[PDB]
Amino acid sequence: NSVTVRQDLERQLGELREEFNALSQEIAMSQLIDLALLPLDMFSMFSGI
Amino acid sequence: MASLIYRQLLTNSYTVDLSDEIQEIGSTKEMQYNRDITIRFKFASSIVKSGGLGYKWSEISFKPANYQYTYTRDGEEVTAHTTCSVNGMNDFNFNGGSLPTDFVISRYEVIKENSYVYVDYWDDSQAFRNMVYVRSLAANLNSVICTGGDYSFALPVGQWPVMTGGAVSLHSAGVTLSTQFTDFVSLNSLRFRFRLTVEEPSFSITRTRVSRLYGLPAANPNNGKEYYEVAGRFSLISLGELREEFNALSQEIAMSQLIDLALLPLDMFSMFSGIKSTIDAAKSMATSVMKKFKKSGLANSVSTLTDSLSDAASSISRGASIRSVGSSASAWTDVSTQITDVSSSVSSISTQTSTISRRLRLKEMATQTEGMNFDDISAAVLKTKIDRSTQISPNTLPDIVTEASEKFIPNRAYRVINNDEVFEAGTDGRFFAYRVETFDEIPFDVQKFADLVTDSPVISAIIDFKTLKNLNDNYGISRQQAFNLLRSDPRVLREFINQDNPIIRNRIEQLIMQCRL
Amino acid sequence: MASLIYRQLLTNSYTVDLSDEIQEIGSTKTQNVTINLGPFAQTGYAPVN
Amino acid sequence: KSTIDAAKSMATSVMKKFKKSGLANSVSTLTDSLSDAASSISRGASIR
Amino acid sequence: NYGINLPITGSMDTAYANSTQEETFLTSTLCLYYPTEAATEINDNSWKDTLSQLFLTKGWPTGSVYFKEYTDIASFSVDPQLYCDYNVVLMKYDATLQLDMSELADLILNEWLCNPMDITLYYYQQTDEANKWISMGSSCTIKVCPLNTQTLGIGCLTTDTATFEEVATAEKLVITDVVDGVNHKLDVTTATCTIRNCKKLGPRENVAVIQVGGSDVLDITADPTTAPQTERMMRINWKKWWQVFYTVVDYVNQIIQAMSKRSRSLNSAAFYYRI
Amino acid sequence: NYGINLPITGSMDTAYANSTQEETFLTSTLCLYYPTEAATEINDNSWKDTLSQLFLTKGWPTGSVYFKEYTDIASFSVDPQLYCDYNVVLMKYDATLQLDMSELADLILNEWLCNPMDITLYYYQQTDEANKWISMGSSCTIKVCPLNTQTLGIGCLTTDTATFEEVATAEKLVITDVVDGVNHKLDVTTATCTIRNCKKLGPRENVAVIQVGGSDVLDITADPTTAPQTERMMRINWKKWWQVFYTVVDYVNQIIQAMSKRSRSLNSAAFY
Amino acid sequence: NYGINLPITGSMDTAYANSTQEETFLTSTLCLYYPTEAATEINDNSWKDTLSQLFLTKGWPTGSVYFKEYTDIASFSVDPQLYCDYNVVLMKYDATLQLDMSELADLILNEWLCNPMDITLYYYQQTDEANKWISMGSSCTIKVCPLNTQTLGIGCLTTDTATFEEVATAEKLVITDVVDGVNHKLDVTTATCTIRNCKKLGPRENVAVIQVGGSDVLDITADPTTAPQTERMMRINWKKWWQVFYTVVDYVNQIIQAMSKRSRSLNSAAFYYR
């Protein structure tokens, strides 16, 4: 009976979204733009978190 | 050039892990010399019976086995010792039933194509003992077939089941390093590992239900032979304090020859070419050099600016009060404008300029700009000396490289042109205002500065005011040239230093002398 | 275009090693893996006489 | 197609071929010929 | 595949296409479902016949009306294949069977998109407030075991059903609801039960559950927040069964008008499948 | 606050600040009240735990949800102390206890203010449709005697309680109502009961009585004229208790959204 | 508007509305808390009555003042259902009970917010200098075990409470404080104790702990750095109990004025408190 399954990670993952949205409604403007003129590459993204 | 190499690294650090993670699983719990080689070895087995009536066996497994012998090579008698072990063996079993009188083998090992045989080898000649630095080794060996002999299971009553057959051929596969530690001393060796191919005959257990299986069981793997033999040939190809030397070694670097080598994307593959090492040094070392970077000055700092943007663009609703000398908040300008976290001695401006330099400066580089960028003068320094040293060994290459970044060109400034106005953030101290053309100075501004810095292209002012104004007067400097001597153009700069030779050759040189570390 | 692809490679060669080093040690190290048999009884007669 | 960890270790093997050919060494030379130019000393096997 | 992806341009022509009951009298069929006790109390060999002549009055041609006998809410709930265009089912308040009744109403009054489930080979989960597990049969006994993101039990061992959580003990019709977005190893008694995964939706433009007795407060939602009261959910005051039927006949059109059988048909009753 | 003097602005900026449920998941507590029979039917030593992991799904951090066991509607009615921010109480239809249930609902679902009464020295009177006498304890038995404007009985002798009018015989929670604007000598069994004078009002932006069983409603109202149906008064169809809880979990937010967070202060609703 | 924040106009009209004590005499209740020994020393069946007539002098109508008898600082620190609008509690210096007294003061003199804790299923942690664990009952005995970021003990085995750290041995009222930002498996004797997680804050615009005897000292800071001295913390020189009460009466308004309503309760606040 272990073999199977059909769904996982979504629930926590579908969940997550609803928060991302709301969390966006606050991002500044100018401060954002700039941070799109900085080659935020690999090493950068997985720094904090 | 340096732009890459440097950045290229911090870009490929994510790797550091993966690799790092290998050596653990795998971690615990010049001069050439030749020699045909004769490898004689044998297996050993451990056979354990279960208790009770005596019809059941609990374990039949391989065990490491030693062999010693002597053979002739080039008119000399060579004494050799080998130890044979296996890995990746497979567990088989035979269940004749649960009655005390039913024949059972709870676990017996079989080596198959997913298994390896290792033979450690040592001999008493001199070339072997002199192997402590190894730059390279390949073996050309004949294969050998190992076949299983019979093994009878003496039951208390009746007819005895007999395991018979089984065979694998051994093929030289991959050459490494290794060393045997006994009660007192060590026996250096680069034990080769044999990959296996199953061969005829298959094995079975008479009187049972086990036949037509392929591989070599542990019951009697030597088949009455005193030893197995693999012979062939192998070829070998062989070869704080630090700083004080780097400095002196710098005092000689040419000028023109240098510059150029800062217009050539000396990236990854380039830097770790010249190094000549024993083994996977420069390799996991180009990775270790990494595993050093992501843990130093340049590292974190860059990791900071990055956030200071996110955080200040993500916050906003709650944007840090901070302060900003300029139109508005923007990490670069402001975050430095305010967190003047150090203190005392001189005048205003200089302090911000300075702190706005720190970020702006060094930092900028690892992203976007024109002409020879400071570091590209640094890289040049490195790829240079790190070649006029010859060394190999691991524990060196890392760090030293890193450390080079954090401590190269202690200070240095920048400039931003806009409407013929050279704004020069003379890091640490100073700051001037030009009229591009007629090299002149008018009130500088923390404001006009603010923005024009924040989001526009910057320039790693190779030569700055001091050198420039002094240059402009005792020469000429066509409007044409000048306009380039600002963007820090390679050419136009190379010219002078290469051609003329006055001043220019100090502003440059002096920098070399500064990347002393 | 090709510029990358080509160069892109020689740039990412340093990797060749790490990987290379796996399949050796990886194989030089290795786990012992299991046989899934036992669908039915081995069952036979169990005494000679 | 196919590529059972082929094109993979193969995109790596394709590598393990490059660093051992024309383009390779050559590029590895120019590089030095610069270092060795400025840095050490110009191997003057005659030079113009 | 004619349908939408177009717009029906309104325009208030305001033309009235009179009546509507005259098309339904001619072209539709009316199926009356009642319990045995209902007919037993009537005690006539010709009651179905007498009512039929009475049905001509209200406008339904002789061969039009059919009379189906469920003998219990539990069996009717299993075998509910709705035979006619318009189905009006008579239910007698039995207070111990209320949820049996609720589960049966939920099935007829609505629409239901269902797929078969293999309890034996796979770990299932409901997706939205509309994904429910409708199981029905002789004796339906469902035990459940919630799985964390590892296929491991949470308050249970996916190995011994003695640790499962029982959510139905021998029912004839069961609409099971579990915390949305969680996998569950299911243990139904498939011998006597059948459990299928259904997605809900379209109310029914047919059944008109007419309730006899009590005082009724029907909460047919799985949640606590909502309470839906539809037109296809009527109630009559119990006196005698003959009276009930007289009223059903005397107000056939009124009852039919509260349904409207265009969305009906389907092609058989309940379920669906689109397996 | 000291403030309510100055309106608030009505401009339609029109910017809804998104979610709402993401502040309540982080900062609020959820307290589930059920009867013993509920848990007994579940028969697991880890049901509170299993449901808690299931509660993470709906978005409530581990230490967030609490499970309080009332064993009867009468006790859950006598000494009241809603513990958490959000309280959702599960009530099982027991038909003989209906008014017991009504009186308990009337208390949780609403906002109460209470001053103490001295039945001994002072005969009291209720003032408006919102002044009620809420008494509760071991055994509450209240007899009353209406006074005319002389402090004299009307159908009773303020001297012998054998002539009083009994309006409650040994209840665990009682909200007594008398003809407004009339004084009454009261005779409660203060030994086992406590009677307090409460003024009603605000409602509760927390209690979400979820009713299991029957059909039928209840009109908290004391009058005959009104019948109020609030969102904090939900109903679930009984099958098995495990199912009830699964639903409560599967629809926690929906249930929470039908409440709010204002109104928690000191537990015990009667205000002395 | 009363369920939101409203801020006041600052113009200096400058017109104080007179008396203030003449609204509190008419509309408020005064509750006096004393220990048994206090009343026993008085030895009269009518002391509560005599003082009440004396209270009319200071301006409190007959049915206004109430007299509640705690017999010990430990029990009183237990069923603190402050009954009246204004509560002035008389505390007699018992030197061995100082901390019992401190913990009780900390509770009355301040505004507390609590939630229930399930010691059985969830190991908790305090968040700021204002998150404290206030437990109270028959016999409160609390043992603690700090967890590292793995749910593993630090100087203890989350499995055997014989390795826990005892921080309270059978008290009647206890405000426990642990290193902020660290999880702890807790082991209280829930049979006789109740432990709840409280966040502090507002203070009390009522009590007025009046201290009899010593040369007094009350610590309400859990820390070492601060020492707060409030107006709702008064002290009287012990002579005889009759004298104490005479003074409390002779200076009721002065004592009441040092408190004042109940900002958190009043009406115009029922939302965020009450």
F250, part of any domain: yes
CA distance B337 to B505: 35
Cβ contacts of F18 on chain A, cutoff 8 Å: 21-22, 25
Q: Write the single-letter amino acid at B10.
A: L
Nearest CA in chain B to D36: B384
| Total number of domains in chain G | 2
C-alpha closest to that of B30 among B132, B174, B176, B121: B132
Is residue G163 marked as binding?
yes
Q: Is the peptide bond before B201 cis (omega within 30 degrees of 0)?
A: yes
Which residue is it, tokens 């209270």? G55
Whether F52 and F177 map to the same domain: the answer is no
Query: Which residues, in sequence order, are CB contacts of F125 under 8 Å at separation 6+?
Result: F178, F180, F181, F182, F183, F184
Contact F102, F211 (CB under 8 A): no
Contact E175, E107 (CB under 8 A): yes
How far is C-alpha B152 from the chain's CA centre? Answer: 53
Quick one: tokens of B451?
Answer: 């923005």
How far is C-alpha G261 from the chain's CA centre? Answer: 16
Q: What CA–CA distances, in Å, run from B505 to B484, B512, E199?
A: 17, 11, 81
Cross-chain residue pair C21–B283, CB shorter than 8 Å: yes
Q: ∠ CA G202-G207-G209 to the nearest 5 degrees?
A: 115
E94, part of any domain: yes
Cross-chain residue pair F1–G274, CB shorter than 8 Å: no
Contact G142, G176 (CB under 8 A): yes
Question: Chain B within 8 Å of D16 (Cβ-Cβ)?
Answer: no
What is the C-alpha radius of gyration for chain F, rounded to an integer number of angstroms?
A: 21
Question: Chain B within 8 Å of D8 (Cβ-Cβ)?
Answer: no
Whether E87 and E122 map to the same domain: the answer is no
Whether E158 and E218 map to the same domain: the answer is no
G17, part of any domain: no
Cross-chain residue pair F83–G274, CB shorter than 8 Å: no
**Cβ atoms within 10 Å of B249's Cβ, excluding its own:** 17
**Cβ atoms within 10 Å of B447's Cβ, excluding its own:** 11
**Cβ atoms within 10 Å of E44's Cβ, excluding its own:** 11
- Nearest neighbour of B99 by CB, restricted to C11, C30, C46: C46
E38, part of any domain: yes
Query: Which residues, in sequence order, are CB contacts of G213 under 8 Å at separation 6+?
Result: G92, G93, G238
Strand partners, F32: F67, F88
Nearest CA in chain E to A8: E149
Question: Chain A within 8 Å of E125 (Cβ-Cβ)?
Answer: yes
Whether E97 and E205 map to the same domain: the answer is yes
Quick one: tokens of G155?
Answer: 């100087």
Whether G105 and G228 map to the same domain: the answer is yes
Whether F107 and F118 map to the same domain: the answer is no
Cβ contacts of D40 on chain B, cutoff 8 Å: 387-388
Q: What CA–CA distances, in Å, run from G138 to G74, G135, G174?
A: 9, 11, 12
Cβ contacts of A19 on chain F, cutoff 8 Å: 19, 22
| End position of a domain, from candidates F199, F228, F249 | F199
E256, part of any domain: yes
Nearest CA in chain A to E181: A11
Strands G113-116 and G193-199: antiparallel
Contact G5, F4 (CB under 8 A): no
Task: Indicate the burial class of D30 (C-beta count within 10 angstroms; 0-12, 13-18, 19 or more).
Answer: exposed
Nearest CA in chain A to F59: A15
| End position of a domain, from candidates F151, F171, F199 | F199
CA distance B488 to B372: 6
Element (H, E) at E245: helix E241-250
- Nearest neighbour of B268 by CB, restricted to C14, C35, C47: C14
E85, part of any domain: yes
Which residue is it, tokens 């890193």? B402
How far C27 CA lies from chain D's nearest CA (Å)?
15
Range of the domain at E131: 113-199
Cross-chain residue pair A7–E149, CB shorter than 8 Å: no
Task: Indicate the burial class of F239 (C-beta count within 10 angstroms; 0-12, 13-18, 19 or more).
Answer: buried
Whether E88 and E205 map to the same domain: the answer is yes
Ramachandran angles phi, psi of G67, nearest 5°: -115, 100
| End position of a domain, from candidates F181, F199, F217 | F199
Whether G101 and G211 map to the same domain: the answer is yes
Q: Kindly report the CATH number assigned to the domain that includes residue F86.
A: 3.40.50.11130
Cross-chain residue pair A9–E185, CB shorter than 8 Å: no
Whether G59 and G193 map to the same domain: the answer is no
F186, part of any domain: yes
Whether E39 and E164 map to the same domain: the answer is no
Q: Kindly report the CATH number assigned to the domain that includes residue G181.
A: 2.60.120.800
CA distance E197 to E124: 9
Nearest CA in chain D to C18: D12
C-alpha closest to that of B401 among B244, B248, B272: B272
Whether E162 and E215 map to the same domain: the answer is no
How far G216 CA lies from chain F's nearest CA (Å)?
32
Q: How many inter-chain contacts (E to F, CB under 8 Å) are there?
A: 97
Ramachandran angles phi, psi of G6, nearest 5°: -135, 130
Contact B105, B68 (CB under 8 A): no
Cβ contacts of B155 on chain C, cutoff 8 Å: 48
Element (H, E) at E39: helix E36-42
How far A32 CA lies from chain E's nearest CA (Å)?
35
Q: Best interface-test mutation with B: which of A25, A34, A40 has the largest number of B CBs within 10 A?
A: A34
Cross-chain residue pair B102–C21, CB shorter than 8 Å: no
CA distance B431 to B346: 14
G89, part of any domain: yes
Whether F106 and F204 map to the same domain: the answer is yes
Instruction: Give the single-character DSSP code of G138.
Output: E
Q: Best interface-test mutation with B: which of C7, C14, C24, C31 has the largest number of B CBs within 10 A?
A: C14
Strand partners, B139: B234
Question: Chain E within 8 Å of A2 (Cβ-Cβ)?
Answer: yes
Contact E201, E112 (CB under 8 A): yes
